[PDB]
Amino acid sequence: TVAYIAIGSNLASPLEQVNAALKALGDIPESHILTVSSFYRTPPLGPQDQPDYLAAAVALETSLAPEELLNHTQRIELQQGRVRKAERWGPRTLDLDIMLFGNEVINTERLTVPHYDMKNRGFMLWPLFEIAPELVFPDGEMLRQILHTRAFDKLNKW
Structure with a gap:
């Protein structure tokens, strides 16, 4: 099955972290990486100028x-990232989110696929479009059409 996973990091120097997470993803049992998007720079929300967030997409073939x-x-989030002291309730330093799993729709207590908000997030859609330009969602909506109609700003490369 092809799973599409979003990777994100709010670390100032995220590349090590992101690369270590990619290594970890490839080593998941019964799974291997097919391709990884370019790394993208996602500007912060907030005038202050937080760190830029690195965003990418991974296509993972898996029998899991x-x-x-x-x-x-x-597990990888726990082993490769952490929550920040300033906000123990806040975001993690390394994000791995399952965006899509084959052509499945999943609505369980533990897992919702497609990712509930991905169609509203340029930082998920653009990297995904780089690696799967012909992708069609389980509900029939075309990734290309969503990007073409909703006109999300392109992200610069990291």
Whole structure:
């Protein structure tokens, strides 16, 4: 099954982190990376100028069940990232989110696929479009059409 995973990091120097996470993803059992998008720079929300967020997309071929894949992405988040002291309730330093899992729709307590908000997020859609320009969502909506009609700003490369 082809799973599409979003990677993100709010670290000032995220490349090490992101590259280590990619290594970890490829080593998930019963799985291997097909391709990885370019790394993109996602500007912060807030006038102050937080660190730029690095965003990318990974296509992962896997024979795991979706919840088994989630076990691994959660594990990698725990092993390769952390929550920040300033906001123990806040974001993690390394994000791995399952965006799509084959052509499945999943609505369980633990997992919602497609990612509930991805169609509203240029930083998810643009990297995805780089690696899967012909992608069609389970509901029939074409990735190309969403980007073409909604006109999200392109992201600069990291």
